[PDB]
Amino acid sequence: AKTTIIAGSAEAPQGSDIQVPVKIENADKVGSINLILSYPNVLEVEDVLQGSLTQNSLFDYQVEGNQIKVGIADSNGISGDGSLFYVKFRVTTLRNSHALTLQGIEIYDIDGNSVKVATINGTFRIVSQEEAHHHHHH
Amino acid sequence: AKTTIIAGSAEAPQGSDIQVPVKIENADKVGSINLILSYPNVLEVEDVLQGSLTQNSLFDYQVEGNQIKVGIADSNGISGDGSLFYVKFRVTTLRNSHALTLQGIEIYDIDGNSVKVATINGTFRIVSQEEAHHHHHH
Amino acid sequence: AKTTIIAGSAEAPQGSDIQVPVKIENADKVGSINLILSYPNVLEVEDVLQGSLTQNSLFDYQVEGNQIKVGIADSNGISGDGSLFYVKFRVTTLRNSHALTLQGIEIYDIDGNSVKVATINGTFRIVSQEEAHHHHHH
Numbered sequence A, B, C: 001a002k003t004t005i006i007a008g009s010a011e012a013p014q015g016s017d018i019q020v021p022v023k024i025e026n027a028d029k030v031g032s033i034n035l036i037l038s039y040p041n042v043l044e045v046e047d048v049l050q051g052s053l054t055q056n057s058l059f060d061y062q063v064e065g066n067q068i069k070v071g072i073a074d075s076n077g078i079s080g081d082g083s084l085f086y087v088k089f090r091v092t093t094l095r096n097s098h099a100l101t102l103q104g105i106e107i108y109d110i111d112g113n114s115v116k117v118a119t120i121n122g123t124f125r126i127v128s129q130e131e132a133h134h135h136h137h138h
């Protein structure tokens, strides 16, 4: 039962907005999380929103260069699976993919103990009407 | 896995004593509980006894008006399912039921964190030889 | 889900070395353990080694008379099942068995709470080529 933080993956054409979640899986009474999400040059941050687990948490973020620093604190504890936050991006046969990387993680439970976490990075690709991808979501 | 506190339900004729438990379900290292159990005018409190989980806890109760204030502290932690205490009451086609209500709950785990709990109230009815109810207990 | 500490059992002829683990089962974020393992006169301690769970714990032991005092501290917490340490012994139809006893246990989780544990002692016998026992290990 290992706590894992996961950046979502996505694909979209130039000019469109995408919503990419960062999720947690198997959280066990997490009380604070600080992390950095790095994103590719092809993306531009439009907004950062609380997720399904953090609607009532103390939530901060700061966008600097190609990274979003996010801070979450929640005296109730966060447990189980769900989104920590969503990033709204705008997208500015071969092809190449880009990483949505999670790093600089600092995570503690509500009793102040360090929590071991695994991380999984996201992948983003610029794509055409290949939004059969939306059609195939599952 | 949500911690729930549940007042038992019962039925009996005038003049008889009944034993109504207040139980906990899915407790996770609970260290202290304060609560109020309100009871109907048709009932009169004869005794308040420790339950299956609190035989060795620090246990206090105070009966004032139509409510029983109960305090439990236990440095070992209380976990799982079982009774917190039992109330011995004396009972003083249509018909009407009465609530055994749980409120004013204050509950913390052994590390001093607030515990989220759900509550379920009990129901009491004055009844005749409908103690096929005892016969059907299951 | 009760935390249990278990001394392993073994059999071997005079003159041979044996490796006996002391294991934990269903540990839940244990932060410190002190215990005493007592052993029979027919055994002599050659070494005491960290186990599968304590390779990176702070680990101390002291052999005095027929008992090994072991101290383990680990800020990460120890959870699940595995060995806490291994003792390398040298063995110095009827027959008689000997106890490898666990006692004097003091165990706390990473938040400093006392942990309830059960213990299971080990059994050692001097044996011949009955090391079909190794052949039958399972």
Ligand SMILES: [Cl-]
Pocket (backbone or CB within 6 Å): A060, A061, A062, A069, A070, A071
């Ligand atoms: Cl921040």
Ligand SMILES: [Cl-]
Pocket (backbone or CB within 6 Å): A105, A106, A107, A108, A114, A115
């Ligand atoms: Cl950390």
Ligand SMILES: [Cl-]
Pocket (backbone or CB within 6 Å): B060, B061, B062, B069, B070, B071
């Ligand atoms: Cl009280």
Ligand SMILES: [Cl-]
Pocket (backbone or CB within 6 Å): B105, B106, B107, B108, B114, B115
């Ligand atoms: Cl509370």
Ligand SMILES: [Cl-]
Pocket (backbone or CB within 6 Å): C060, C061, C062, C069, C070, C071
């Ligand atoms: Cl020692």
Ligand SMILES: [Cl-]
Pocket (backbone or CB within 6 Å): C105, C106, C107, C108, C114, C115
């Ligand atoms: Cl102890």
Ligand SMILES: [Mg+2]
Pocket (backbone or CB within 6 Å): A111, B111, C111
């Ligand atoms: Mg604590």
